[PDB]
Amino acid sequence: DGEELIGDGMERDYRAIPELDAYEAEGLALDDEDVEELTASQREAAERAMRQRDREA
């Protein structure tokens, strides 16, 4: 039928795996960057474009 989720040995699913438990630095943009967010017009433009592509699909 299936697997019982609550029962003997469930603690196995709750352990720490140190090597998997933190983000790595590859791909990460950090840190001191002054990067700033969308303005309202940049946002509105993007959302306009996304409405568009949604229409085309």
Partner: protein, 77 residues
Amino acid sequence: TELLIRKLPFQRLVREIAQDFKTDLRFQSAAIGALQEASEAYLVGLFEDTNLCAIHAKRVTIMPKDIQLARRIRGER
């Protein structure tokens, strides 16, 4: 409690998915985190709904058709 998805595998998954959209992308840590929170919330809610479906069918074991029905009604595909 308090662990759900592991950070590294998730990060990898996000980067791998983001490739096909834009090459040489970079993510803020906070952004990966945001996606992970959102993803965990999404799946947990979806399992609540899935479970409602299984119970409706008089089953304790949830099945792919339970998920499918839930997503169908929520209008996902």
